Amino acid sequence: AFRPISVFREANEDESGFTCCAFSARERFLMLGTCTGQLKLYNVFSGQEEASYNCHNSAITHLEPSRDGSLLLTSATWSQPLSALWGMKSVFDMKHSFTEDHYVEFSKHSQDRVIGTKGDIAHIYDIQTGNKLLTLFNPDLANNYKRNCATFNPTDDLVLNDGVLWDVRSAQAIHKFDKFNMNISGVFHPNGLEVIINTEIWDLRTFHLLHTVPALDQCRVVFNHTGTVMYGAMLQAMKSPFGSSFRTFNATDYKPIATIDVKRNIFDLCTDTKDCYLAVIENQGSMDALNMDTVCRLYEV
Ligand SMILES: NC(=O)C[C@H](NC(=O)c1c[nH]c(/C=C/C(=O)N2CCCCC2)c1-c1ccc(Cl)cc1F)c1ccc(F)c(Cl)c1
């Protein structure tokens, strides 16, 4: 069971505007983005605010801390710039911005690059210089996914963009995965062997279809750090990205574990580095509430 541990809202706000979250390198502290563009650090057990930083002029949609704790990526809705990289050393400071990309991720093995997405286009940037190294787009192989997000594989050699597998070194598209849906572009399994594109699981060696998993339709997915569990939540067609439910799956065989309906719209979820806890941002009140008034709920896995 997910055992509820704590709940909290954004402090000194009439309406709570938490939108996204990620655990910090510090045990007990969660980073939360807000609908007015702030980044907050909270004690996840006591629900107390520790620090606040001004990041964007619009809602933070997504964020991602580097493992070493030194760097943070943020993305926003209708700001310019849409994404940015922040230093979390002495002074919280913007290192680089990514004017055109509405979503960004770090490289996975060595976190020296950022991959950004604009529509069906991937951009790869050097963290040090901020320089754009590669643009990845092939008009001949595009799938035109509506909710595309470009991503590196575990060893940083490959990129999946718009259902197309790219070799990063040669900057060549090596395979296009056929389109089976309008929206979801897919991710790499942390095992480095499989690609998960909506309901289709592809073998990365053969490009053969390994499994079909209907429950993953229209889902964003995230794995726990140890790569044993996969969380999925179905996108909706300051509105929540997701519905009221998320599902877990065994990462080794894609078998369903649990379906969790929180009966409230979900904005985000994340696990801690040790995969003990799950933090979920949920809107209070009722399904599809108009009022933006989110809480963070912490569960023990
Ligand atoms: N942090 C993570 O990576 C976890 C991940 N979060 C997001 O994917 C996410 C989390 N948030 C968003 C946007 C938020 C957004 O667009 N808005 C609209 C304006 C008001 C704020 C929310 C997204 C998101 C939506 C679409 C796209 Cl294609 C890209 C995305 F990143 C997740 C994985 C599995 C899950 F079960 C859950 Cl509940 C969450």
From Swiss-Prot:
Subunit structure: Component of the DCX (DDB1-CUL4-X-box) E3 ubiquitin-protein ligase complex, named CUL4A-RBX1-DDB1-DCAF1/VPRBP complex. Interacts with DDB1; the interaction is direct. Also forms a ternary complex with DDA1 and DDB1. Interacts with NF2 (via FERM domain). Component of the EDVP complex, a E3 ligase complex containing DYRK2, EDD/UBR5, DDB1 and DCAF1. Interacts with DYRK2; the interaction is direct. Interacts with RAG1; the interaction is direct. Interacts with LLGL1 and LLGL2. Interacts with histone H3. (Microbial infection) Interacts with HIV-1 virus Vpr protein; the interaction is direct.
Region annotated WD repeat-like region, chain positions: 13-212
Family statement: Belongs to the VPRBP/DCAF1 family.
Positions of WD repeats: 13-52, 55-96, 98-135, 137-169, 170-212
Motif, DWD box 1: chain positions: 164-171
Organism of origin: Homo sapiens
PTM annotation (Phosphoserine): residues: 240
Outcome following mutation: residue 205 to A: Loss of interaction with DDB1, no effect on interaction with TET3
Motif position, DWD box 2: 200-207
Gene name linked to the record: DCAF1
Name recorded for this polypeptide: DDB1- and CUL4-associated factor 1
Superkingdom: Eukaryota
Stated role: Acts both as a substrate recognition component of E3 ubiquitin-protein ligase complexes and as an atypical serine/threonine-protein kinase, playing key roles in various processes such as cell cycle, telomerase regulation and histone modification. Probable substrate-specific adapter of a DCX (DDB1-CUL4-X-box) E3 ubiquitin-protein ligase complex, named CUL4A-RBX1-DDB1-DCAF1/VPRBP complex, which mediates ubiquitination and proteasome-dependent degradation of proteins such as NF2. (Microbial infection) In case of infection by HIV-1 virus, it is recruited by HIV-1 Vpr in order to hijack the CUL4A-RBX1-DDB1-DCAF1/VPRBP function leading to arrest the cell cycle in G2 phase, and also to protect the viral protein from proteasomal degradation by another E3 ubiquitin ligase. The HIV-1 Vpr protein hijacks the CUL4A-RBX1-DDB1-DCAF1/VPRBP complex to promote ubiquitination and degradation of proteins such as TERT and ZIP/ZGPAT.
Parent-protein residues present: 1079 to 1389 of 1507
Tissues with expression: Ubiquitously expressed.
Domain notes: The protein kinase-like region mediates the threonine-protein kinase activity.
Expression triggers: Up-regulated in a number of cancer cell lines (at protein level).
Localization in the cell: Cytoplasm; Nucleus; Cytoplasm, Cytoskeleton, Microtubule organizing center, Centrosome
